[PDB]
Amino acid sequence: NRSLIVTTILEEPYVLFKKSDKPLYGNDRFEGYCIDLLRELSTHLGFTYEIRLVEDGKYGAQDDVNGQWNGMVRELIDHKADLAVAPLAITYVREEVIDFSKPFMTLGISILYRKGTPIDSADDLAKQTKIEYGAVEDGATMTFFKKSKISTYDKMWAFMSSRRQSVLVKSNEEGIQRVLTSDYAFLMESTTIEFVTQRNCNLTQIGGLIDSKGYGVGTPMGSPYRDKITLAILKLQEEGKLHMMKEKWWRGNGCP
Amino acid sequence: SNRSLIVTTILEEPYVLFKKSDKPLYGNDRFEGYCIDLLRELSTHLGFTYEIRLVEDGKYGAQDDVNGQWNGMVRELIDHKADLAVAPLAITYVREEVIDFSKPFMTLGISILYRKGTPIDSADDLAKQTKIEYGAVEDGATMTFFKKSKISTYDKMWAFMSSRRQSVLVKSNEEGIQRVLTSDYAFLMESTTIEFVTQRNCNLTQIGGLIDSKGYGVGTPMGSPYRDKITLAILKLQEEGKLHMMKEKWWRGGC
Ligand SMILES: N[C@@H](CCC(=O)O)C(=O)O
Ligand SMILES: N[C@@H](CCC(=O)O)C(=O)O
Ligand SMILES: [Cl-]
Ligand code: NA
Ligand code: NA
Ligand code: NA
């Protein structure tokens, strides 16, 4: 049968290009948690697939003026991909336009910053401007702040929006580099913060989780794959396989 | 006017309780708790009226392996005896095969409730001994997790629970807590419930971490159009901070 087209995005340790000396081709180019997940889904559901990086490099947000979506969300809306297998947050505005499986991982927005400071919460950032802060442009964290009616988060959005050319970044990688090279705190998903702080011993999570959400496999609205992938995810979780996959991709040396 | 939806639920503090009062209470007015607040929010967002009915057999729901029949709130949905189940109802593979669920409104896992002051640190420590008995709610998701598990520790625990089931499987979380307090017994319990119980009884503790991960969702019959509408409403409530506020309201109180 026809191979499914799977849109994804580079994001360690979910999706990475494998390191090698020989050139790699096709699906063999990729590894990571989400790649292992895709392989398990493919064997459980009995499909073959072709992995394609989303061409615009975005997760997906709606443009407030013209109403168009971008990123992996737009690929699904336009039926250019059958699945999005990535650390793609299940959100209200996305669920209105695409379908998602039930979550394979649960997480929330938090703060990545340097250690040793009196900053302990989002409120501490919101009430000042000397320490800049931001988020990935056109992702779920940005959209959370843009939409929020909560005073602290609305204030933070006004700051980020004013300073967006400097403080909104194109990837988590760029946000980490800003934390490491300037006085800057990055609003980042907690699963990713866990990965980063175990490898950057001068960095830490500040405060707890600001919200709660899951990552799910995206499908076009109405796809028959959505409910089948939910069932496969529930089976992999119950059997302990998702936990093993998390340990594989997050485990490492650590910090004193 | 549209037919009111029949909502099946189960008594379980602080999700669903009878209100305390001296005058008698009637109809929906009898009930309070996190899930009742959730139901009220869903009804205003989606535009329905409802009648709350406690599940007749007092069970969450499991399948009988001899005759294939389900029980509990799961069976009420399969048979279209309820439109919705709004309860701490775990989303599980075996249930998702037969009913539909919204996306989760809370995330949790199985853990262990026991008395303080013990070297027992995990399910592995329990499984390797038989002096301390252990069990779970009969015909709920925790029992079914053990019954289905191929993981050696958990399959050893199921063998023990099954052997001793008339004594160690209980009808409700409340009966499990009473067994922990009145005998040498550890209860396999969902973590959000452990959090509630241990903040109010300072002689009790959680043992170990979470053995698994799952969510609670609103149940619907398979194919219901309410499932995806309720998912959207839950996502909106989460993002606005209302689910967090509801958790704080119903779990607030310390040791
Ligand atoms: N995982 C996010 C991108 C990263 C973020 O927004 O923090 C998304 O699905 O949009
Ligand atoms: N919440 C459970 C019942 C309690 C338990 O199994 O621990 C269920 O949905 O079956
Ligand atoms: Cl769903
Ligand atoms: Na990328
Ligand atoms: Na949807
Ligand atoms: Na289902």
UniProtKB/Swiss-Prot annotation, chain B:
Question: Any coiled-coil ranges, and where?
Answer: none
Which residues of this chain are annotated as glycosylation sites? N2, N203
- Give tissue specificity per the record: Highest expression is found in the olfactory lobe, piriform cortex, dentate gyrus, hippocampus, granular cell layer of the cerebellum, and in caudate-putamen.
User: Which residue stretches are annotated as topological domain Extracellular?
Assistant: 119-255
Amino acids binding L-glutamate: P88, A90, R95, A141, T142, E190
Posttranslational modification, per the record? Sumoylation mediates kainate receptor-mediated endocytosis and regulates synaptic transmission. Sumoylation is enhanced by PIAS3 and desumoylated by SENP1. Ubiquitinated. Ubiquitination regulates the GRIK2 levels at the synapse by leading kainate receptor degradation through proteasome.
Q: Which cysteines are joined by disulfide bonds?
A: C202-C255
Compartment annotation: Cell membrane; Postsynaptic cell membrane
Task: Provide the assembly information.
Answer: Homotetramer and heterotetramer with GRIK5. Tetramers may be formed by the dimerization of dimers. Assembles into a kainate-gated homomeric channel that does not bind AMPA. Can form functional heteromeric receptors with GRIK4 and GRIK5. Can form functional heteromeric receptors with GRIK3. Interacts with DLG4. Interacts with NETO2. Interacts (via C-terminus) with KLHL17 (via kelch repeats); the interaction targets GRIK2 for degradation via ubiquitin-proteasome pathway.
The job of this chain, per UniProt, is described as: Ionotropic glutamate receptor that functions as a cation-permeable ligand-gated ion channel, gated by L-glutamate and the glutamatergic agonist kainic acid. L-glutamate acts as an excitatory neurotransmitter at many synapses in the central nervous system. Binding of the excitatory neurotransmitter L-glutamate induces a conformation change, leading to the opening of the cation channel, and thereby converts the chemical signal to an electrical impulse. The receptor then desensitizes rapidly and enters a transient inactive state, characterized by the presence of bound agonist. Independent of its ionotropic glutamate receptor activity, acts as a thermoreceptor conferring sensitivity to cold temperatures. Functions in dorsal root ganglion neurons.
* Homology family: Belongs to the glutamate-gated ion channel (TC 1.A.10.1) family. GRIK2 subfamily.
**Other notes:** The postsynaptic actions of Glu are mediated by a variety of receptors that are named according to their selective agonists. This receptor binds domoate > kainate > quisqualate > glutamate. It does not bind AMPA without coexpression with GRIK5.
Listed name of the protein: Glutamate receptor ionotropic, kainate 2
Species name: Rattus norvegicus
The UniProt gene name for this protein comes to Grik2
